[PDB]
Design an enzyme around this catalytic site. Sequence first.
Site, PDB file in Angstrom:
ATOM      1  N   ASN A  33      14.514   3.017  11.659  1.00 55.15           N
ATOM      2  CA  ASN A  33      14.972   1.775  11.046  1.00 55.15           C
ATOM      3  C   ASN A  33      15.326   0.720  12.083  1.00 55.15           C
ATOM      4  OD1 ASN A  33      14.747   3.210   8.706  1.00 55.15           O
ATOM      5  ND2 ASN A  33      16.850   2.901   8.012  1.00 55.15           N
ATOM      6  N   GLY A  51      13.689  -0.480   5.547  1.00 51.08           N
ATOM      7  CA  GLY A  51      13.579   0.854   6.121  1.00 51.08           C
ATOM      8  C   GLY A  51      12.444   1.742   5.625  1.00 51.08           C
ATOM      9  N   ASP A  53       9.009   3.605   5.163  1.00 56.20           N
ATOM     10  CA  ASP A  53       8.127   4.033   6.257  1.00 56.20           C
ATOM     11  C   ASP A  53       7.048   5.037   5.839  1.00 56.20           C
ATOM     12  OD1 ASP A  53       9.556   6.491   6.052  1.00 56.20           O
ATOM     13  OD2 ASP A  53      11.050   5.739   7.441  1.00 56.20           O
ATOM     14  N   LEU A 194      -3.039 -20.964   9.892  1.00 56.66           N
ATOM     15  CA  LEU A 194      -2.516 -20.653   8.577  1.00 56.66           C
ATOM     16  C   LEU A 194      -0.991 -20.724   8.678  1.00 56.66           C
ATOM     17  CD1 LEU A 194      -3.139 -19.594   5.672  1.00 56.66           C
ATOM     18  CD2 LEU A 194      -3.129 -17.274   6.651  1.00 56.66           C
ATOM     19  N   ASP A 199      -3.695 -18.995  15.358  1.00 54.22           N
ATOM     20  CA  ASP A 199      -5.006 -18.682  14.802  1.00 54.22           C
ATOM     21  C   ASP A 199      -5.965 -18.154  15.866  1.00 54.22           C
ATOM     22  OD1 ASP A 199      -6.204 -18.909  12.120  1.00 54.22           O
ATOM     23  OD2 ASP A 199      -7.765 -20.058  13.188  1.00 54.22           O
ATOM     24  N   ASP A 229      -6.978  -9.340   5.166  1.00 55.15           N
ATOM     25  CA  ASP A 229      -6.087 -10.433   4.818  1.00 55.15           C
ATOM     26  C   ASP A 229      -6.744 -11.793   5.108  1.00 55.15           C
ATOM     27  OD1 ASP A 229      -3.388 -11.842   4.513  1.00 55.15           O
ATOM     28  OD2 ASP A 229      -3.746 -12.149   6.653  1.00 55.15           O
ATOM     29  N   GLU A 258      -8.907 -10.530   0.350  1.00 56.17           N
ATOM     30  CA  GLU A 258      -8.124 -11.351  -0.570  1.00 56.17           C
ATOM     31  C   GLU A 258      -8.548 -12.808  -0.479  1.00 56.17           C
ATOM     32  OE1 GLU A 258      -3.822 -11.446  -0.052  1.00 56.17           O
ATOM     33  OE2 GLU A 258      -3.518 -12.185  -2.080  1.00 56.17           O
ATOM     34  N   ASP A 329       1.610 -10.986  -3.892  1.00 58.70           N
ATOM     35  CA  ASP A 329       1.566 -12.467  -3.939  1.00 58.70           C
ATOM     36  C   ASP A 329       1.662 -13.098  -5.337  1.00 58.70           C
ATOM     37  OD1 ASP A 329       1.360 -12.963  -1.175  1.00 58.70           O
ATOM     38  OD2 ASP A 329      -0.818 -12.639  -1.225  1.00 58.70           O
TER      39      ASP A 329
HETATM   40 CA   LIG Z   1      12.745   4.245   8.142  1.00 64.40          CA
HETATM   41 CA   LIG Z   2      -8.562 -18.809  11.084  1.00 59.99          CA
END
Ligand SMILES: [Ca+2]
Ligand SMILES: [Ca+2]
Length: 687
Positions: A33, A51, A53, A194, A199, A229, A258, A329
């Site tokens: 953590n 925390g 994981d 972005l 970038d 992404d 996405e 999102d």
């Molecule tokens: Ca953890």
């Molecule tokens: Ca770019």
Amino acid sequence: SPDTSVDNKVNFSTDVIYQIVTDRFADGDRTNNPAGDAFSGDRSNLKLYFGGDWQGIIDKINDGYLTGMGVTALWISQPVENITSVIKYSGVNNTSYHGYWARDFKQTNDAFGDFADFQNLIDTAHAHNIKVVIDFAPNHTSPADRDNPGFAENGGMYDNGSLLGAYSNDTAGLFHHNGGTDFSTIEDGIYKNLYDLADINHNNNAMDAYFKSAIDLWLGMGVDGIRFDAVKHMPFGWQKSFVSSIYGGDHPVFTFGEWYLGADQTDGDNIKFANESGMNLLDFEYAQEVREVFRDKTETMKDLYEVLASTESQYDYINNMVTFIDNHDMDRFQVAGSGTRATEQALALTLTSRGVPAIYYGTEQYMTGDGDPNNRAMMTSFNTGTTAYKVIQALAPLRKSNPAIAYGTTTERWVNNDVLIIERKFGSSAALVAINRNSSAAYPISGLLSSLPAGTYSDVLNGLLNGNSITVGSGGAVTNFTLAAGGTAVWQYTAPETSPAIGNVGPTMGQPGNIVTIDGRGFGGTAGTVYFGTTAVTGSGIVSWEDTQIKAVIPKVAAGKTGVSVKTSSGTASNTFKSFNVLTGDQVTVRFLVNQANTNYGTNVYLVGNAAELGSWDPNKAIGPMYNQVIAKYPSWYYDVSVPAGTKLDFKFIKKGGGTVTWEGGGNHTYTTPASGVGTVTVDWQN
Ligand SMILES: [Ca+2]
Ligand SMILES: [Ca+2]
Ligand SMILES: [Ca+2]
Ligand SMILES: [Ca+2]
Ligand SMILES: [Cl-]
Ligand SMILES: [Cl-]
Ligand SMILES: [Cl-]
Ligand SMILES: [Cl-]
């Protein structure tokens, strides 16, 4: 191995993905953590680490929470090392808990675990027949201010611990220094930052090589899929070349991106990306529409089917669409204070509809929360007894067992404002799904027709969502029945296939020599023939062959889109998988620039050439409209294009607009592309 095997990395329509925001799922190891200002022990600041994981995910696989639901893939936050600095945005301390602020793509985020932990996650998932998908965000590193090196970590990029460069003193030219995007155009969003994220400049071969090396690291550990992404924010050409290198390497895997779409939005660039990049997409058209119909109740079942029909028409690989009803999102699907049936029906539709279903963690616990980060609260409960949990548990396994669900066509059988009855069909297998979103009114259903063989069918959900049994006659006619208020039912038939049927081919794009995976039914046990177009692949061209899966080497055939089909050892022909994109060879990304290309308002410059990758001289396949604001300025135009490596290209530019098409005069421009990586070619417009 069969189409349904966890070993099948390239095709995912038999799977159900569970999307986990790693930090917000389960804290399995308190010793990793973060601490101090980077950590919220009382969880009052949803922008700090909580925390969660990899050990926590492992625990929920082992203790039966995830396996009990029947999910067969986990999509997790980007696993790579992120910045560790706390940034104060808008009065609130923020951290990299979400994983999108990378600083070393070759090391782990220590908060999630070390490489041993990651291997344990891969190994544990696989032993339970669960695939693992990682977020991958090669668009950028982290927040940076070119004029203030002390802000955050200045977008610094490391390579297995050693510094490649940071944003303010970008000695190696790793980044763009074009300001931040205003999202006004696609070009603007690709070649500027972005938000404030430094970038990456993928036209710098240092970066092409780095990201190929990085992804190879993770794939070599056994990762089964990649969720890219911000695909709208990187060059299409670079991404096409990037995935081609994955498909041509040791670890072909399922990829999807996405490309956000709002409600009531279709986008031609979104469609072109899904059809032509070699990478698949999250299905926002589906998601937004399901939300309108079930969550907001602002549109009807007729509208819902219209979207199923229009998406089918526009996307070449509809079994690859990653469907969902919410995500990291979007506002949480469950509306606080409202009933849960909307969630349960939306889940049922998604689990039985075409594509690859994804469920956002906590959907099955009816978690609420609008906006980021309220939509990323810690998982509230691991109650295996909720209605939604049981819905997923009942329906998820059908994607493995019923090929109509995994691969089948989609047909409307009955529709009004509140009721949708659709049928999935593949070979002799079929599934019929009925949904009535009206929680106050039942609907008599008369004259329903199906492809189901005669007999009595129980609801797969056993009436959990107020479904019912049906009786089917000799012609598939369904005896009249009443669909209860809030009713949802699934009726299914699975049969052994004797005739070969192809459900999917993955990847959907590749150069000669790549191995593709052909999934379906009725291929038989004895090796037959694979066809690309009319070209037969036999013998050593067949890597492996069994009833539900064939692996084959792409033959040296003419580049371009073609049909893939099979013929059994007995000579029986299958259906055709349409639009397989045969590439000319290994790809490189080339930035094309043309100077002195003046146009009238309304007319744009495009690129055309002899290679399939350049549209094969077809003005309708011309590449563009080209860009002219950022990297190069009008009357110069530019575009980044995936083209075959070590190959001489003939090419010209054309101006299209006002129903007119005007080609350059003179002889073709020529250019021999680089052996690997990336290149740039600059020419002047020939009148
Ligand atoms: Ca953890
Ligand atoms: Ca770019
Ligand atoms: Ca167990
Ligand atoms: Ca709509
Ligand atoms: Cl294990
Ligand atoms: Cl079929
Ligand atoms: Cl079957
Ligand atoms: Cl063989």
